[PDB]
């Protein structure tokens, strides 16, 4: 019926689009200054990729990126938005007197019609850990509207992963789960659920930020080129790694962040969510190992991170790792859809 509805449980989609229907949620993204400001810079400083061009904005939300394409001289911008935010975008197009130049199209990019092909697709479809929400697939799907040799902004995306040590983060999981380790909570022995409580906490990726000192080796990266990639390429994402340990300690899990590059005619501009960069609404994400691993500087931490896309607009994450010198091993399964938002 639709590529979107095929890969998506209606229940997930309803919530998803209701969330984006809220002005406050659009506002939450807009106020991310690093995010919004870099998009603006990327577009305006590459004004020749936009001047008198035809543009598609995939998931326009408020319209903000389409207004930036207009500030850069675009002739015609089709702004597609699946949520009821489309109605609000439309109100802005009129009140900013850009009816001749921005056409808001309510609906899913997998289901609407465009009148013509475009020179360039712009989007902000990045979830935490890059891939969450599965909107990158919508963005790739949109290339069916892209004129041969058209461009995409952003053009490529890099995921970085790196091992970390954070003993307190690790212990918090047990302190939380040990609520259940009591033989008489109002006369009830809860102990038998302690293991299930631990498993539940460890299945949640942790969204928050951290001092770079916790990282124990230089990151490995996995790159998606949005010009070349097919939707199908994001269904099963396998990220091998061989870390060369810069520091000795207990490895408690892997940390994830991402960068995107806008590769324009005039310049490449980068948007980075790295822990070395000022903070964004994406923070960073950490996947704990339920059994941590000891490594000494010079050892190799090798393994695989596998993300398997699911019908709830997220991924099932599987991380397997070992210290090559000792053979000690840790396996972990996480649900990217249900992160723990730890940050204050």
């Amino acid at each position: 019926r639709s590529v979107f509805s095929e890969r998506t449980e209606e229940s997930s989609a309803v919530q998803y689009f209701q969330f984006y229907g809220y002005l406050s949620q659009q506002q939450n993204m807009m106020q991310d200054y690093v995010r919004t400001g870099t998009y603006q810079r990327a577009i305006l400083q590459n004004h020749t990729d936009f001047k008198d061009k035809i543009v598609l904005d995939v998931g326009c939300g408020s319209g903000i990126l389409s207004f930036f394409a207009a500030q850069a001289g675009a002739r015609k911008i089709y702004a597609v938005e699946a949520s009821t935010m489309a109605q609000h975008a439309e109100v802005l197009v009129k009140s900013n007197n850009l009816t001749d130049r921005i056409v808001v199209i309510p609906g899913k990019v997998e289901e609407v019609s465009l009148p013509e092909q475009v020179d360039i697709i712009i989007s902000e479809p990045m979830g935490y850990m890059l891939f969450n929400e599965r909107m990158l697939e919508s963005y790739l799907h949109a290339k069916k509207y892209l004129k041969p040799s058209g461009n995409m902004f952003p053009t490529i995306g890099d995921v970085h992963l790196a091992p970390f040590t954070d003993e307190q983060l690790y212990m918090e999981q047990f302190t939380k789960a040990n609520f259940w380790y009591q033989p008489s909570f109002h006369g009830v022995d809860l102990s038998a659920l302690r293991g299930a409580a631990v498993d539940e906490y460890f299945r949640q990726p942790v969204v928050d930020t951290f001092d770079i000192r916790i990282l124990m080796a230089k990151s490995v990266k996995y790159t998606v080129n949005f010009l070349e990639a097919k939707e199908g390429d994001l269904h099963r994402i396998e990220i091998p790694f061989k870390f060369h340990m810069l520091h000795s300690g207990l490895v408690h899990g892997l940390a994830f962040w991402f960068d995107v590059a806008f590769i324009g005619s005039i310049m490449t501009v980068w948007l980075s969510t790295a822990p070395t960069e000022p903070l964004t609404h994406w923070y960073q994400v950490r996947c704990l190992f339920q059994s941590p691993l000891f490594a000494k500087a010079g050892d190799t931490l090798s393994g695989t991170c596998l993300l398997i896309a699911n019908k709830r607009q997220s991924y099932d994450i599987s991380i397997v790792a070992q210290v090559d010198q000792t053979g000690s091993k840790s396996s972990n399964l996480l649900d990217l859809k249900n992160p723990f938002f730890r940050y204050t």
Binding site: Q25, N28, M29, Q31, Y128, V207, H281, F341
Partner: peptide
């Protein structure tokens, strides 16, 4: 929430 709160 797909996108974390931010300020």
């Amino acid at each position: 929430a797909p996108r974390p709160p931010f300020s």
